[PDB]
Amino acid sequence: MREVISIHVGQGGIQVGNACWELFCLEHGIQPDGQMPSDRTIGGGDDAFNTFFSETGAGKHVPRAVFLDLEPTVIDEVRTGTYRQLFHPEQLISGKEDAANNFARGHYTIGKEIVDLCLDRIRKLADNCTGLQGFLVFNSVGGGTGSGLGSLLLERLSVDYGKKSKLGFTIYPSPQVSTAVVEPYNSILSTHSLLEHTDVAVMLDNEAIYDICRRNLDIERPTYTNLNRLIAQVISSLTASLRFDGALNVDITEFQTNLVPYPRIHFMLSSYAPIISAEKAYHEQLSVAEITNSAFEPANMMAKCDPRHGKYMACSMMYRGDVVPKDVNASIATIKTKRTIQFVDWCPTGFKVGINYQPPTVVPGGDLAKVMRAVCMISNSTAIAEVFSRLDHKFDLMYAKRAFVHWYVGEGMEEGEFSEAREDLAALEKDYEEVGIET
Amino acid sequence: GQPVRSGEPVLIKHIPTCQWLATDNVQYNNEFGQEFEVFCNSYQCHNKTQNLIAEKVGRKTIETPMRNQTNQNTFRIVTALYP
Amino acid sequence: RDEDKAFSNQTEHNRFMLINLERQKNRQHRQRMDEIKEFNLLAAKEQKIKLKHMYD
Amino acid sequence: YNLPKTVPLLPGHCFPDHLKESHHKTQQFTLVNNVHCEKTNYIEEKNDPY
Amino acid sequence: QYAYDFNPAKTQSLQSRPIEHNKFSAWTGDQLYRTSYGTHWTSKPQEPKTHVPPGYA
Amino acid sequence: MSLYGVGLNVQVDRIKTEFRLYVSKQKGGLNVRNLRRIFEQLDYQQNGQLNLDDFKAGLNKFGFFLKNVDYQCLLKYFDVEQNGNVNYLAFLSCISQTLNQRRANFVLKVFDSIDSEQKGAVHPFSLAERLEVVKNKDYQIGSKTREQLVGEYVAQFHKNQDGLITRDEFVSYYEDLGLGISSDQHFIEILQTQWGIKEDDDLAITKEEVKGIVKTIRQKLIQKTKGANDEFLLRKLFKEFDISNSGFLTLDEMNAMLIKLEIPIQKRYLNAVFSQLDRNHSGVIEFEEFVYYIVNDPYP
Amino acid sequence: MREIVHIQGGQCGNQIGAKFWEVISDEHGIDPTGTYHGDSDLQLERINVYYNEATGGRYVPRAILMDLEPGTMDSVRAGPFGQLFRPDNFVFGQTGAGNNWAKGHYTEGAELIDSVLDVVRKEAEGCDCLQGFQITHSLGGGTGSGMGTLLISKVREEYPDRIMETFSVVPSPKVSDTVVEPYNATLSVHQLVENADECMVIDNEALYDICFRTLKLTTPTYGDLNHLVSAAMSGVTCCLRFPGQLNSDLRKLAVNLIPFPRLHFFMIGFAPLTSRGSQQYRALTVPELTQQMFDAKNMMCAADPRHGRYLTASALFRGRMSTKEVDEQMLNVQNKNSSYFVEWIPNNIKSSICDIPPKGLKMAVTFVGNSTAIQEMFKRVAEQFTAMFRRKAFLHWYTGEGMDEMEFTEAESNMNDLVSEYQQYQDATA
Amino acid sequence: MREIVHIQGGQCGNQIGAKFWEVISDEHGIDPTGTYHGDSDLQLERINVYYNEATGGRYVPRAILMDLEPGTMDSVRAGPFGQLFRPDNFVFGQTGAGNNWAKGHYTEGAELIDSVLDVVRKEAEGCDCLQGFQITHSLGGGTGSGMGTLLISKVREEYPDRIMETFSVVPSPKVSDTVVEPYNATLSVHQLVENADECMVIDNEALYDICFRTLKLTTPTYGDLNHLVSAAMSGVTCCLRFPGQLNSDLRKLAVNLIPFPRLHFFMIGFAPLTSRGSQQYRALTVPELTQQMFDAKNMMCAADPRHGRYLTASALFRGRMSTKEVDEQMLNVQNKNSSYFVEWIPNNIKSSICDIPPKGLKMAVTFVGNSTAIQEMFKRVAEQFTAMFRRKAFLHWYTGEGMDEMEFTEAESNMNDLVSEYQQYQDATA
Numbered sequence A: 001m002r003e004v005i006s007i008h009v010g011q012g013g014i015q016v017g018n019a020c021w022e023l024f025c026l027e028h029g030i031q032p033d034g035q036m037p038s039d040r041t042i043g044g045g046d047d048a049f050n051t052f053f054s055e056t057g058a059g060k061h062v063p064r065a066v067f068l069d070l071e072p073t074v075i076d077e078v079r080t081g082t083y084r085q086l087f088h089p090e091q092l093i094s095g096k097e098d099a100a101n102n103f104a105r106g107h108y109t110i111g112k113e114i115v116d117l118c119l120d121r122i123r124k125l126a127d128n129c130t131g132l133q134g135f136l137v138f139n140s141v142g143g144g145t146g147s148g149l150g151s152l153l154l155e156r157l158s159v160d161y162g163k164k165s166k167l168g169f170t171i172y173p174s175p176q177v178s179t180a181v182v183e184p185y186n187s188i189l190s191t192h193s194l195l196e197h198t199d200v201a202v203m204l205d206n207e208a209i210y211d212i213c214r215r216n217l218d219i220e221r222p223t224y225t226n227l228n229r230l231i232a233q234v235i236s237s238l239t240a241s242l243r244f245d246g247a248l249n250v251d252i253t254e255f256q257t258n259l260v261p262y263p264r265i266h267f268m269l270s271s272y273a274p275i276i277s278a279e280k281a282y283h284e285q286l287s288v289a290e291i292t293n294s295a296f297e298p299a300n301m302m303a304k305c306d307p308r309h310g311k312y313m314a315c316s317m318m319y320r321g322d323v324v325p326k327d328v329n330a331s332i333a334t335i336k337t338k339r340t341i342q343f344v345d346w347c348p349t350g351f352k353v354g355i356n357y358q359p360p361t362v363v364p365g366g367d368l369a370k371v372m373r374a375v376c377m378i379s380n381s382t383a384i385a386e387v388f389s390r391l392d393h394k395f396d397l398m399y400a401k402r403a404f405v406h407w408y409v410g411e412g413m414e415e416g417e418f419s420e421a422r423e424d425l426a427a428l429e430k431d432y433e434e435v436g437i438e439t
Numbered sequence B: 001g002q003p004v005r006s007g008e009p010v011l012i013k014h015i016p017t018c019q020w021l022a023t024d025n026v027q028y029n030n031e032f033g034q035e036f037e038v039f040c041n042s043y044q045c046h047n048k049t050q051n052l053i054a055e056k057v058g059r060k061t062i063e064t065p066m067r068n069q070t071n072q073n074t075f076r077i078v079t080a081l082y083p
Numbered sequence C: 001r002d003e004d005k006a007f008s009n010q011t012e013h014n015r016f017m018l019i020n021l022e023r024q025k026n027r028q029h030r031q032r033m034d035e036i037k038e039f040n041l042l043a044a045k046e047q048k049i050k051l052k053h054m055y056d
Numbered sequence D: 001y002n003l004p005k006t007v008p009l010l011p012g013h014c015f016p017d018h019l020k021e022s023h024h025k026t027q028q029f030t031l032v033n034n035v036h037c038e039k040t041n042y043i044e045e046k047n048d049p050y
Numbered sequence E: 001q002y003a004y005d006f007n008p009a010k011t012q013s014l015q016s017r018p019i020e021h022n023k024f025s026a027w028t029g030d031q032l033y034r035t036s037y038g039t040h041w042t043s044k045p046q047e048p049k050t051h052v053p054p055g056y057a
Numbered sequence F: 001m002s003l004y005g006v007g008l009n010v011q012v013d014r015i016k017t018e019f020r021l022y023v024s025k026q027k028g029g030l031n032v033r034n035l036r037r038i039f040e041q042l043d044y045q046q047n048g049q050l051n052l053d054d055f056k057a058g059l060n061k062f063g064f065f066l067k068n069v070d071y072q073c074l075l076k077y078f079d080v081e082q083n084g085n086v087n088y089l090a091f092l093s094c095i096s097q098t099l100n101q102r103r104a105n106f107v108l109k110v111f112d113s114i115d116s117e118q119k120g121a122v123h124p125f126s127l128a129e130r131l132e133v134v135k136n137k138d139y140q141i142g143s144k145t146r147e148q149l150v151g152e153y154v155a156q157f158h159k160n161q162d163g164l165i166t167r168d169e170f171v172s173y174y175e176d177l178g179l180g181i182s183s184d185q186h187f188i189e190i191l192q193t194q195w196g197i198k199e200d201d202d203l204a205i206t207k208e209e210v211k212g213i214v215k216t217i218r219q220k221l222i223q224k225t226k227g228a229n230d231e232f233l234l235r236k237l238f239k240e241f242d243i244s245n246s247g248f249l250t251l252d253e254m255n256a257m258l259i260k261l262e263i264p265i266q267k268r269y270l271n272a273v274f275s276q277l278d279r280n281h282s283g284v285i286e287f288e289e290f291v292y293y294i295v296n297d298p299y300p
Numbered sequence G, H: 001m002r003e004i005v006h007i008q009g010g011q012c013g014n015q016i017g018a019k020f021w022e023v024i025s026d027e028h029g030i031d032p033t034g035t036y037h038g039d040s041d042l043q044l045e046r047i048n049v050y051y052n053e054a055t056g057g058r059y060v061p062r063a064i065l066m067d068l069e070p071g072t073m074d075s076v077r078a079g080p081f082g083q084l085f086r087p088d089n090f091v092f093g094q095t096g097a098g099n100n101w102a103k104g105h106y107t108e109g110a111e112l113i114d115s116v117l118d119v120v121r122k123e124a125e126g127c128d129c130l131q132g133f134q135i136t137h138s139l140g141g142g143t144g145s146g147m148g149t150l151l152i153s154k155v156r157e158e159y160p161d162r163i164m165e166t167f168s169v170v171p172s173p174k175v176s177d178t179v180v181e182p183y184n185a186t187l188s189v190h191q192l193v194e195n196a197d198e199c200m201v202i203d204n205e206a207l208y209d210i211c212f213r214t215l216k217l218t219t220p221t222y223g224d225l226n227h228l229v230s231a232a233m234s235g236v237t238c239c240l241r242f243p244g245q246l247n248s249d250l251r252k253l254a255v256n257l258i259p260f261p262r263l264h265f266f267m268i269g270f271a272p273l274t275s276r277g278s279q280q281y282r283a284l285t286v287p288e289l290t291q292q293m294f295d296a297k298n299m300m301c302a303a304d305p306r307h308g309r310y311l312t313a314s315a316l317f318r319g320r321m322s323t324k325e326v327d328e329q330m331l332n333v334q335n336k337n338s339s340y341f342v343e344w345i346p347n348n349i350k351s352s353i354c355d356i357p358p359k360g361l362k363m364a365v366t367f368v369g370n371s372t373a374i375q376e377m378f379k380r381v382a383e384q385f386t387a388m389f390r391r392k393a394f395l396h397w398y399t400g401e402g403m404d405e406m407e408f409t410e411a412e413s414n415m416n417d418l419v420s421e422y423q424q425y426q427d428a429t430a
């Protein structure tokens, strides 16, 4: 009776969903058909899969997920790919025309004919769940239907359900690495839209992950499959407490109650440790003291942001494996003593710890090593203010000459949205500054 | 508390002294030709092990030995071949 | 009889210490074996992904 | 004498062990229609010609 | 020597211990035994009547 | 009281001490042999097994009462086959002493005095003759029905198939009587008054007396000549009279030798130190060992 | 006769209750299936204090387990000794608390507590002559610190004559387990000081210190911590279950321990505790027991006793021991450390004796003492609360459920006045 | 019953302490396990002097092992007889002194001595009637000198009435181990004069001379050297543990050896000493023992007593003997060598008799005397100190942690008065 429903919108969400859902299938022992292995013959079947999977009454399991996209290419791959018979046929919604990197296209003119279909499917899944903890969403901010539909769905969910917790794993554009040209335009438009509609947001830009794989996994030419495997591991550790018993359990609802000092301050960046290949795993002892220090390294963060340039407001970390309450306490005390890491003055108590017993699982054909301990750390800091400023500068550079705006204003949106969205972002930039100064 | 078998290498130690019976290549002269000497000494390894810090943390305990020995303390009981 | 009670009762503590020490010695042996277990698979997978990196 | 065959539990002598193959949690308690309910495990019979 | 055991006296669960069988009338050796008379001279159910006096209704 | 582990041994020891204390205090007509002759009536089938109720009833009849919990411990300890019934034979097997050596010495010599014809068995009337003679000076040898009239002083014992009592039971009955009485002097006085026989060793040389004697020997030597000497002096007597040059010392030679150096030890005292000094028990002691013990010994 | 019902909530409460019930079952010789298998008669006379009776001769504890989420309840049901609790004593919600005092005390616990109040009313009416209640919960958590405190309040106006006992795991800032812990801690303390009859503070730092420096075991676990807590719990009430030279129940303990009604916060400690590798050198004597009793590092709280003065103290001894030895040791330790005891009360130590030691041991003791040194914890919690409340960070989460800052201000003022009056008696002289 | 506790400081103290406990255990027949297996009952009557009773009837020594670095104590624990010492009696740090007096007395000793001070306070509390202390350490080391002498100051303040003994091994300048010897030797003496009831000076040169010349050992080792010290240590308190014709404890020796409180520096000797090849040819008698007792080559110090006057002396006799020869031997040696005895105290010799000789010997004698010839050892120490101090060599290490040159001036200043005090009480005549 602890169910979470995940939303995957856009190509970034769907390709993350493929890697995310192959891990859950292997973790809980489900074959690509939704059926348990034919031989099996153990008995005492444990229904820990109810968090993500649903029983059909006799036979297969159907995930509690929905996929949205306007281009039919990626969905048709899923419907033809390895897991064709896993997902329900009518929970894979596909459009006919792409958004074409335009926020207005997927928010005003063509996104209104699909949003009705998804809300019907969401209601059916939610009515099935009896202990729904909340929603998870996966979207790419620098995209058309990723930010268009993603903003529209979040707005609709706010009035349809309300107090239900919603978590957001957005993918912000890299500081210098870029695939498109108009990312800053729809980055702010989406961020302003989801500013008052999401509860917790996690930054998942790409350049940070590229650096991590090169530095740690000794991979000189990574691909998107490698990146989506790392992100899925973050999700698994994040929700591992709802299906595996531990010494100290944590819940989805006990994240937005501790990491959010104020309603407008809910942006945070994540870190994971140990992200290590077996080259260096054969040598390191990988103690709990060592892993908890490596989680605080700025080079190990999942977002292109330096915490050394700002203060820490709150940090939450989850341990899974064979950790002991002795060494978690001892190592945490050392972190507080360290001068290189500092907290804001009005927050003397600044941690939350969760302990789980299940060691992380390993995916065949994967890149990570098999370990006994792991930690996932979600911290809210003031240093996120720099990513908005750098993203703001590029927008102001284009918007001076009103470039590319005819591609937007002719698709149902008014000219005034650009100013107010920029206006809203400007207030937030030094809003993080006001909270970070001493009393 | 386990039975002692005849033939395998064993250790003989004195209880008031905790010193293992030993014999080395030390010459001695007597009417019965040339023979060596028998004494008591613990031929332990020279390398030291941080046992005290292990005890305070709680990793090892005193009765379990920590330092190896040299084969000069090894003795074997030999019995008759035929009944 | 008081002398007998002292000897009879202290013997319980003697057995008591042996049980704990023996089982604690057992636990470390199992846990150490699990550390050998991890590096067993990791050693194979190093020689594994080495060939995979050459292609593709 | 009569020495105990097994160690008795004491404030620091139980020592739970958690080195299992899989640490899975079973959902035995469920709240449906604002009514408490639990699974009927440890009670099932199998068959007979009765 | 050995760890700590939970179950004493080796009490096997009745789940696997034999099978249900016809003893449902174990208590009902005195179940149709009313007590208005009875428990005054006898403790077991009274025999079926063979004779009745006038006005037995 | 929390008879989890060793507690079974402690509580049953407490019960045994309490029973011994009770019986010794009353000291009178009650006897441990009286208890065993009560059980078999409740035993019925002579199986040797009794339930908790019958066991409690029998003990209460004797006049012994314990806690309600204390009865549980006895049953738990003495129900060896776990049939729910105590073993009174095992219970009476315990709480029974082996009798002191001095008491055994006195009981054996009385039996020897009675049995002057050395068969090891004594006719019942021969005993009863003595018990009646000591009780009065005017009983006279002859009686009308003397055998049956005087046999009531006896038959507290038991006789074998032949009809005579054995030495084994004669001691066995008296050691049973040795539980109601816990005073050695009172036991000896009772036996001697009953049997008209009062013969026993006066005493035995104690460790304190031996230490005093040996300290007297070692101190007397030091007064002679000087510190480095007196070893030659001690060896000189052996040189003067040890003709066979074997190097062994005898009790007669040691006595005479100690007579020479103004030390007249009593024969009983000299025997005690002689016996303590040697452990081979052939009556001969090496002179080197003797001089070592006398001179070069750190402890008194 | 004078039975007590056990009610508990929260994750920590559920775990502590599970360990305590396992310890009690072992002590009374109850198998996991619930059938009595004791060997002595003394283990059956007073079983009615903690265990009820059902058909077939089995015993079920009068325990009530409550939580807004069934996670820990589900975890504890499948464990050993989990079949003793009847299914009707399990009450659970559907949403959860989220480490929020407001959610656990006003919007969810308030609407859910009707069923558990019905259950506790049924148990209290079923018992012959109730002696009191006892609580195990955590102040730093949401559902525990809210629902348990509200239930304490309600049962307090409903039964104004029965005794109250609590076992509160007060948070320590060294283990900042929850960033919103000061609000919950101060609100729970403000609620608790108004109704709770006895309070015993337990700190994870103190438990870690015990398990690391005394027991010397390499891998501490919450199992061991809960075992320590459960041993401390059973020590205080052993005398209520077993005979002894001097009998003392919870009412007598309170009578001989609490000087003033607002001063009802204590620290507990259990002896003897020794390592496996060092047990062969120590002895088993009452002087050794009492010298380990008063050791500062042996306490189960962060408060250090030699920084303050022992107002009152009480000891509950288990095993066969001598009144001479125990009271002479008490008098000697009282005389030699006159600076550590307040002056205007002579003989501020109570002695209690029980003849039944814990299984596998020959002597034991439990120490409960009211010392003025606990104000350090209150001062630290209050200073963190006021520092974090000056900016009123995280306050919107609590305000969203209709709460007002006037209650926060009143709770802080009550805590400050408690600290002031509690410090005043430290310097008080005759 | 008048038991004494043992404190072992420094690397030398650990090595001296190891061999000393081996001899005492041998003298009482104690196995390394801890179970008594003696031959006579007298070996058990006074076992409480050095050993505490534990579970199972085993005995544990009441000795505290102290050092900043555990490297030295690490080797002794693993070797033979490493099992007697209770693990709670070992205290160690993480850095080490490194032959720096101030570092082991101001920086590291200050923050570490709290632990050891608590342990020794517990030991002195456990004993019914403490008789005195004894300390074995080195004045040429860092941990032995600095933290070792500081603990003497603290316990002196807490226990101002009990007697204290120190077996100080002041290193000699003929061959030296530490180049900073004069500094930490001088400062220790300044702190030791006003707190130590007695001083027992031991020199390495005398130990080497005895082995080569008296024992004729071609390859002596520290094991042999430690045994000679250990043999004398047990002989000092032999009469306290065993019966005898005349009884004398440590306090009685203090009364008859110290005319003025500042004159408490003794020098020791032990007799008899012979090689294996000469045991048969030598007859042991009282005239033979007293001849070797007063021989200058026998004494434990490099200072020659023939260059001064014996202020007082004391002789302890072990073994059964009469009293007339002992009384007259002390009288005759006093008359014939009257030039070596100061006049204003008549009959300045103390005699005691114990009737339990050491194992392997029939008679033994321990000699302790107060002679003015000990001032010569102070003279050369001051000679080396001022030669190094005038250039301020190695001074940056001492003054790098708050020590000031003002301390050095008084340390040497106090030494001059002691040297002058001995000289004035060497030529004065009635």
Ligand SMILES: Nc1nc2c(ncn2[C@@H]2O[C@H](COP(=O)(O)OP(=O)(O)OP(=O)(O)O)[C@@H](O)[C@H]2O)c(=O)[nH]1
Pocket (backbone or CB within 6 Å): A009, A010, A011, A012, A015, A016, A070, A071, A098, A099, A100, A101, A102, A140, A141, A142, A143, A144, A145, A146, A147, A171, A179, A180, A205, A206, A224, A225, A227, A228
């Ligand atoms: N990290 C990561 N990012 C991805 C992945 N796939 C797509 N993206 C992100 O998606 C952004 C562009 O959006 P698209 O891939 O075109 O998909 P979209 O978000 O639905 O946008 P549309 O093309 O308008 O439908 C790129 O900037 C990428 O950062 C992926 O597999 N991993």
Ligand SMILES: Nc1nc2c(ncn2[C@@H]2O[C@H](COP(=O)(O)OP(=O)(O)O)[C@@H](O)[C@H]2O)c(=O)[nH]1
Pocket (backbone or CB within 6 Å): A247, A248, G009, G010, G011, G012, G015, G016, G097, G099, G138, G140, G141, G142, G143, G144, G145, G169, G177, G204, G207, G222, G223, G225, G226, G229
């Ligand atoms: N001693 C002990 N403390 C525990 C245990 N479980 C949890 N805790 C403590 O409880 C705190 C968290 O309480 P929480 O779970 O939020 O309480 P809840 O909200 O009422 O369920 C942590 O700081 C832990 O230190 C346990 O089994 N033993």
Ligand SMILES: Nc1nc2c(ncn2[C@@H]2O[C@H](COP(=O)(O)OP(=O)(O)O)[C@@H](O)[C@H]2O)c(=O)[nH]1
Pocket (backbone or CB within 6 Å): H009, H010, H011, H012, H015, H016, H097, H098, H099, H138, H140, H141, H142, H143, H144, H145, H169, H171, H176, H177, H178, H204, H222, H223, H225, H226
């Ligand atoms: N008599 C004796 N002296 C020793 C022994 N071991 C070392 N020493 C002396 O101790 C001196 C060195 O002392 P040191 O170790 O620096 O003292 P610490 O710094 O206080 O530990 C050397 O001059 C040695 O002569 C021993 O076993 N016996």
Ligand SMILES: [Mg+2]
Pocket (backbone or CB within 6 Å): A011, A071, A098, A143
């Ligand atoms: Mg696209």
